[PDB]
Design a protein around this motif. Structure first.
Motif, PDB file in Angstrom:
ATOM      1  N   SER B  24      39.332  52.218  27.956  1.00 30.80           N
ATOM      2  CA  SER B  24      39.198  51.048  28.788  1.00 30.80           C
ATOM      3  C   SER B  24      40.606  50.397  29.121  1.00 30.80           C
ATOM      4  CB  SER B  24      38.362  49.900  28.215  1.00 30.80           C
ATOM      5  OG  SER B  24      38.849  49.553  26.938  1.00 30.80           O
ATOM      6  N   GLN B  31      43.750  50.014  37.247  1.00 32.84           N
ATOM      7  CA  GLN B  31      43.172  49.156  38.260  1.00 32.84           C
ATOM      8  C   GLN B  31      44.228  48.039  38.663  1.00 32.84           C
ATOM      9  OE1 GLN B  31      39.066  46.784  38.495  1.00 32.84           O
ATOM     10  NE2 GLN B  31      40.172  45.846  36.803  1.00 32.84           N
ATOM     11  N   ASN B  35      45.762  47.890  42.526  1.00 32.69           N
ATOM     12  CA  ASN B  35      45.475  46.704  43.285  1.00 32.69           C
ATOM     13  C   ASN B  35      46.740  45.939  43.614  1.00 32.69           C
ATOM     14  OD1 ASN B  35      42.780  47.387  43.411  1.00 32.69           O
ATOM     15  ND2 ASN B  35      42.116  45.791  41.885  1.00 32.69           N
ATOM     16  N   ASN B  42      49.219  45.996  52.189  1.00 30.29           N
ATOM     17  CA  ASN B  42      48.653  44.994  53.085  1.00 30.29           C
ATOM     18  C   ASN B  42      49.601  43.846  53.444  1.00 30.29           C
ATOM     19  OD1 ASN B  42      46.112  46.185  53.345  1.00 30.29           O
ATOM     20  ND2 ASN B  42      45.541  45.487  51.272  1.00 30.29           N
TER      21      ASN B  42
ATOM     22  N   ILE C   1      44.911  49.223  59.842  1.00 29.70           N
ATOM     23  CA  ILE C   1      45.327  49.665  58.463  1.00 29.70           C
ATOM     24  C   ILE C   1      45.073  48.563  57.415  1.00 29.70           C
ATOM     25  CG2 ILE C   1      47.322  50.321  56.995  1.00 29.70           C
ATOM     26  CD1 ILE C   1      48.433  51.467  59.869  1.00 29.70           C
ATOM     27  N   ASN C   2      44.275  48.890  56.396  1.00 27.83           N
ATOM     28  CA  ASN C   2      43.995  47.981  55.307  1.00 27.83           C
ATOM     29  C   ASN C   2      43.844  48.804  54.052  1.00 27.83           C
ATOM     30  OD1 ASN C   2      42.144  45.581  53.808  1.00 27.83           O
ATOM     31  ND2 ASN C   2      43.540  44.827  55.438  1.00 27.83           N
ATOM     32  N   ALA C   3      44.487  48.367  52.975  1.00 24.98           N
ATOM     33  CA  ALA C   3      44.348  49.040  51.699  1.00 24.98           C
ATOM     34  C   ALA C   3      43.283  48.268  50.923  1.00 24.98           C
ATOM     35  CB  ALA C   3      45.704  49.082  50.909  1.00 24.98           C
ATOM     36  N   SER C   4      42.329  48.988  50.365  1.00 23.17           N
ATOM     37  CA  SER C   4      41.269  48.336  49.602  1.00 23.17           C
ATOM     38  C   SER C   4      41.648  48.209  48.120  1.00 23.17           C
ATOM     39  CB  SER C   4      39.927  49.070  49.789  1.00 23.17           C
ATOM     40  OG  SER C   4      40.102  50.454  49.529  1.00 23.17           O
ATOM     41  N   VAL C   5      40.949  47.295  47.455  1.00 19.42           N
ATOM     42  CA  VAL C   5      41.123  47.009  46.051  1.00 19.42           C
ATOM     43  C   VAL C   5      40.062  47.825  45.293  1.00 19.42           C
ATOM     44  CG1 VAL C   5      40.065  44.963  44.639  1.00 19.42           C
ATOM     45  CG2 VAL C   5      42.456  44.755  45.872  1.00 19.42           C
ATOM     46  N   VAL C   6      40.250  48.097  44.002  1.00 16.50           N
ATOM     47  CA  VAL C   6      39.186  48.782  43.276  1.00 16.50           C
ATOM     48  C   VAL C   6      38.572  47.758  42.328  1.00 16.50           C
ATOM     49  CG1 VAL C   6      40.762  49.621  41.486  1.00 16.50           C
ATOM     50  CG2 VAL C   6      38.573  50.831  41.961  1.00 16.50           C
ATOM     51  N   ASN C   7      37.271  47.816  42.078  1.00 17.65           N
ATOM     52  CA  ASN C   7      36.824  47.033  40.926  1.00 17.65           C
ATOM     53  C   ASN C   7      36.012  47.851  39.903  1.00 17.65           C
ATOM     54  OD1 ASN C   7      34.861  45.560  39.163  1.00 17.65           O
ATOM     55  ND2 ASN C   7      36.373  43.916  39.577  1.00 17.65           N
ATOM     56  N   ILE C   8      36.609  48.130  38.766  1.00 15.90           N
ATOM     57  CA  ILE C   8      35.898  48.819  37.738  1.00 15.90           C
ATOM     58  C   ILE C   8      35.896  47.852  36.567  1.00 15.90           C
ATOM     59  CG2 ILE C   8      36.326  51.160  38.511  1.00 15.90           C
ATOM     60  CD1 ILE C   8      38.835  51.245  36.652  1.00 15.90           C
ATOM     61  N   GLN C   9      35.953  46.545  36.860  1.00 17.87           N
ATOM     62  CA  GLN C   9      35.897  45.645  35.798  1.00 17.87           C
ATOM     63  C   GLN C   9      34.589  45.745  34.955  1.00 17.87           C
ATOM     64  OE1 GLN C   9      38.806  44.117  34.887  1.00 17.87           O
ATOM     65  NE2 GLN C   9      37.786  43.608  32.926  1.00 17.87           N
ATOM     66  N   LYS C  10      33.396  45.917  35.569  1.00 21.19           N
ATOM     67  CA  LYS C  10      32.134  46.098  34.811  1.00 21.19           C
ATOM     68  C   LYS C  10      32.210  47.263  33.843  1.00 21.19           C
ATOM     69  CE  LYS C  10      28.652  48.614  37.786  1.00 21.19           C
ATOM     70  NZ  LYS C  10      27.433  48.948  36.902  1.00 21.19           N
ATOM     71  N   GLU C  11      32.787  48.371  34.311  1.00 24.00           N
ATOM     72  CA  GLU C  11      32.968  49.536  33.481  1.00 24.00           C
ATOM     73  C   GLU C  11      33.953  49.338  32.302  1.00 24.00           C
ATOM     74  OE1 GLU C  11      32.978  49.772  36.904  1.00 24.00           O
ATOM     75  OE2 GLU C  11      31.192  50.998  37.286  1.00 24.00           O
ATOM     76  N   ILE C  12      35.125  48.764  32.570  1.00 27.93           N
ATOM     77  CA  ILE C  12      36.111  48.402  31.571  1.00 27.93           C
ATOM     78  C   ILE C  12      35.409  47.606  30.509  1.00 27.93           C
ATOM     79  CG2 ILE C  12      38.211  46.823  31.200  1.00 27.93           C
ATOM     80  CD1 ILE C  12      39.142  48.026  33.999  1.00 27.93           C
ATOM     81  N   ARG C  14      32.051  47.298  29.680  1.00 24.68           N
ATOM     82  CA  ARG C  14      31.039  48.088  29.024  1.00 24.68           C
ATOM     83  C   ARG C  14      31.624  49.023  27.940  1.00 24.68           C
ATOM     84  NH1 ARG C  14      28.663  51.277  33.424  1.00 24.68           N
ATOM     85  NH2 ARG C  14      28.186  49.274  34.493  1.00 24.68           N
ATOM     86  N   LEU C  15      32.761  49.681  28.243  1.00 27.61           N
ATOM     87  CA  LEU C  15      33.406  50.555  27.282  1.00 27.61           C
ATOM     88  C   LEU C  15      33.784  49.659  26.110  1.00 27.61           C
ATOM     89  CD1 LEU C  15      35.524  52.907  29.537  1.00 27.61           C
ATOM     90  CD2 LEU C  15      33.428  53.536  28.331  1.00 27.61           C
TER      91      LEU C  15
ATOM     92  N   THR E  21      29.750  55.963  32.102  1.00 30.50           N
ATOM     93  CA  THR E  21      30.532  54.788  32.498  1.00 30.50           C
ATOM     94  C   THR E  21      32.054  55.128  32.834  1.00 30.50           C
ATOM     95  OG1 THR E  21      29.168  53.188  31.373  1.00 30.50           O
ATOM     96  CG2 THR E  21      31.374  52.648  31.701  1.00 30.50           C
ATOM     97  N   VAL E  32      39.589  54.590  45.722  1.00 31.55           N
ATOM     98  CA  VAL E  32      40.581  53.623  46.193  1.00 31.55           C
ATOM     99  C   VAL E  32      42.034  54.200  46.305  1.00 31.55           C
ATOM    100  CG1 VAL E  32      41.685  51.406  45.667  1.00 31.55           C
ATOM    101  CG2 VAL E  32      39.129  51.825  45.462  1.00 31.55           C
ATOM    102  N   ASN E  36      43.897  54.188  49.936  1.00 30.47           N
ATOM    103  CA  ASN E  36      45.230  53.633  49.983  1.00 30.47           C
ATOM    104  C   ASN E  36      46.287  54.642  50.382  1.00 30.47           C
ATOM    105  OD1 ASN E  36      43.856  51.365  49.343  1.00 30.47           O
ATOM    106  ND2 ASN E  36      44.911  50.909  47.438  1.00 30.47           N
ATOM    107  N   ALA E  39      45.884  54.988  54.150  1.00 27.66           N
ATOM    108  CA  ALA E  39      46.435  53.795  54.764  1.00 27.66           C
ATOM    109  C   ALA E  39      47.938  53.861  54.973  1.00 27.66           C
ATOM    110  CB  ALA E  39      46.041  52.502  53.965  1.00 27.66           C
TER     111      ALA E  39
END
Ligand code: NA
Ligand code: NA
Lengths: 30, 49, 29, 49, 46, 27
Positions: B24, B31, B35, B42, C1-12, C14-15, E21, E32, E36, E39
Motif C-alpha cells: 500500500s 499515486q 498526480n 496541465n 490536452i488534459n492529464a488525468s489524476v488517478v485515485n486508488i485511495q480506496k484500494e490503498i 483496504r490493503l 485489490t 492514468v 498522461n 497527453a
C-alpha cells in the motif's frame, strides 16, 4: 516554475522480494 | 504439535501483513507522483495556451 | 490536452485494513 | 490430519510468494515509466524555456 | 484442529481479496500513466 | 521528446490468477 517529480519506491520493491524469500522460513516440514 | 504449526502460521501472517503495508505505501507513493506529474503537465498546457 | 489524476485511495486503504484485520487471524498459542 | 493442514498451508505460501515477486515486478515497471515520463516532461520544459 | 483451520481459512480469504485489490490498483495506475503519456506525446507533436 | 507506455497487464493478470488459485488451498 514547472517541474515533474521522480518517485522512489525501490526500498518497497526490494522489501517485497525479500519478504517472499523470508516466507521460506515459515514453510512446514512434513 | 499444532503449537509449532500454529507458530509457523503466525510467522507467515506477520510477514504477509508486512508485504501488504509495504505494497500500500509503494502504491501511495506512485499515486502521489503520478498526480503531481499530471498537475505539472496541465499547468504547462495552460501556460502555453 | 488534459492529464488525468488517478485515485486508488480506496484500494490503498483496504490493503492497510486487511493488514490490521489479519491480527484477528493470529492463533492464540 | 496435520499433514493435510501443513500441505495446504505450504501450497498457499507458495502462491503468496509468487504474488509478492509479481507485485514487486509490476511496481518496478511502474516506477521506471513514471520516472522516464517525469524526465521527458522536464526536458520539454527545459527546451521551451 | 478446527481452530487452526478456521483461522487459516479466514486469513486466506482476506489475502485473496488483497491480491484482487492490488491488481485493481495496479490497473488504475497503469491507465492514468498511459493516458498522461499520450497527453504529453500529443503536446510534443504540437 | 517522448513519453513511454507502461505494460504490467501480464502482472495484473497473474495476481488475479493467484487469487483464484488460493481457493484450491482452503479447508
Ligand atoms: Na512469476
Ligand atoms: Na497462468
Amino acid at each position: 516554475g514547472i517541474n515533474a517529480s521522480v518517485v522512489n519506491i525501490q526500498k518497497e520493491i526490494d522489501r517485497l522480494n525479500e519478504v517472499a524469500k523470508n516466507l521460506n522460513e515459515s514453510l512446514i516440514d512434513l | 504439535n499444532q503449537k509449532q504449526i500454529a507458530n509457523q502460521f503466525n510467522k507467515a501472517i506477520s510477514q504477509i501483513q508486512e508485504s501488504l503495508t509495504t505494497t500500500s505505501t509503494a502504491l501511495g507513493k506512485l499515486q502521489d507522483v503520478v498526480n503531481q506529474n499530471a498537475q505539472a503537465l496541465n499547468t504547462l498546457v495552460k501556460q502555453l495556451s
